[PDB]
Write a protein that binds this ligand. Structure first.
Ligand SMILES: Nc1ncnc2c1ncn2[C@@H]1O[C@H](COP(=O)(O)OP(=O)(O)NP(=O)(O)O)[C@@H](O)[C@H]1O
Ligand SMILES: [Mn+2]
Ligand code: NA
Length: 427
């Protein structure tokens, strides 16, 4: 097993960090043994999966055990977000908490591990954090079940014609990480015009396309960071430009332009898609260096927004506490405004940032006028260059011109049409 998970790890106030490399058995070997002990010792246990794919991983791994899975049992399994979102309202309590993929910089994930750390530090519970890359540790080349040959090469950032034959002359299957859906689209189009089979994985295509990968065995999986955790792509090569999109609050608005360098935790997950089989050598082809300074991203403000509203006094998981942008509690809402906040998160697909600004500032849950009364520069444009228009229930023609402008609502995985359903009062 692992050394620190013999006994006493289940003791209130005990925080155990399992730095375990990719493919080392966190989800399917360690976790079911932690759960067998928890059930034996009759300890109320929370298990947090980052995503639906890892949650189904856990269902197989915990098959034949009395466990309760959340979209008799004393073990509850649910997503990082599910945990945080239910605490935005008669709270359930657990004396043991296990967080799988505890490096994830999704704001729900940062908020969940901050809450659980704050509890463990108060002797309310025992916490286990499992990840290849514990927050604090900078290691882009962790250990692997088999060998990986890593080589720096120039990687195309978009369509290309000649000069990159090493890409198409490769005889195995590849996972190519791209910083955005749109960049993913341009790479896929070139690969198919070169006669390669491609499946694109991202927030729009995952639920329908991920299970085709096993079955169709495409030449290429062109994937965003959606495939960094619990995606089994069964490839022999990763291509990794080591970039990601960077949602950033700039002049009171959330922008989504350009890229940043990935963190080491991200590079390590991307590389970790390969080298999962002893006695096989796989390839990791990358371009450039990593950047662990992600303190500028809106994710940290979004994490405080969530943590401030599920909580004394709470901090982020110790090593991340430096990236909390304001003093603890800054973002706490009244109970009534928190209800509205939760509704916008869970029912309207809002970002934490947008949901907080609306719930904090808008008198009533029925108001939609904030969607057209913003400053002129906040107007939202269709691909054809015209400003989006819609009709309020009284037939008034509106221009989509929100007071609080979050680019994430209008591209990269979200559609203007779904925001208009909200803005038009069809919600
Ligand atoms: N062929 C395999 N190689 C490695 N692990 C495997 C394999 N088949 C099933 N598994 C399980 O898959 C899981 C992968 O190991 P794990 O430590 O969870 O990786 P990781 O760093 O967490 N990478 P990821 O899980 O995708 O984020 C373990 O729980 C293994 O028991
Ligand atoms: Mn895993
Ligand atoms: Na396809």
């Amino acid at each position: 097993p692992q050394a620190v998970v013999g006994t006493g790890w289940t003791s209130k106030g005990q925080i155990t960090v399992l730095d375990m490399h990719p493919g080392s058995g966190k989800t399917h070997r360690v976790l079911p043994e932690l759960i067998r002990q928890c059930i034996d010792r009759r300890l109320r246990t929370l298990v947090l999966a980052p995503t639906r794919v890892v949650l189904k991983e856990m269902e197989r791994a915990l098959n034949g055990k009395r466990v309760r899975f959340h979209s008799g049992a004393i073990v509850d399994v649910m997503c990082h977000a599910t945990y945080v979102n239910r605490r935005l309202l008669g709270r359930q309590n657990w004396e043991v908490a296990i967080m799988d993929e505890a490096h994830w910089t999704d704001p729900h994930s940062i908020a969940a591990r901050g809450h659980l750390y704050t509890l463990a530090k108060e002797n309310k519970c025992a916490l286990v954090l499992m990840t290849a890359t514990p927050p604090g540790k900078s290691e882009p080349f962790p250990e692997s079940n088999g060998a990986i040959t890593s080589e720096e090469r120039q990687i195309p950032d978009g369509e290309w014609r000649d000069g990159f034959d090493w890409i198409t002359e490769y005889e195995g299957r590849t996972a190519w990480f791209v910083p955005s859906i749109a960049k993913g689209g341009a790479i896929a189009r070139t690969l198919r015009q070169k006669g390669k089979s491609v499946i694109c994985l991202n927030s729009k295509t995952f639920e329908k396309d991920y299970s085709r990968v096993r079955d169709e065995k495409p030449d290429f999986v062109v994937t965003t960071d959606i495939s960094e955790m619990g995606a089994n792509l069964d490839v022999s090569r990763v291509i990794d430009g080591r970039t990601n999109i960077k949602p950033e609050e700039v002049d009171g608005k959330v922008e989504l332009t350009g890229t940043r360098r990935v963190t080491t935790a991200s590079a390590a997950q991307r590389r970790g898609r390969v080298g999962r089989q002893d006695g096989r050598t796989d390839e990791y082809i990358y371009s450039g260096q990593c950047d662990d300074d992600d303190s500028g991203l809106v994710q940290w403000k979004e994490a405080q927004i969530l943590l401030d509203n599920i909580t004394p006094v709470a901090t982020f998981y110790g090593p991340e506490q430096d990236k909390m942008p304001e003093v603890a509690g800054h973002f706490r809402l009244t109970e009534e405004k928190r209800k509205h906040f939760r509704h916008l998160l869970t029912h309207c697909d809002f970002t934490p940032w947008l949901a907080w600004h609306v719930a904090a500032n808008v008198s009533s849950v029925t108001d939609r006028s904030w969607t057209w009364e913003g400053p002129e520069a906040n107007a939202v444009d269709e691909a054809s260059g015209d400003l989006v228009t819609f009709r309020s229930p009284n037939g008034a023609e509106r221009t989509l011109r929100p007071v609080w402008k979050d680019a994430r609502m209008f591209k990269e995985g979200r559609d203007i049409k779904e925001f208009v359903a909200y803005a038009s009062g069809r919600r």
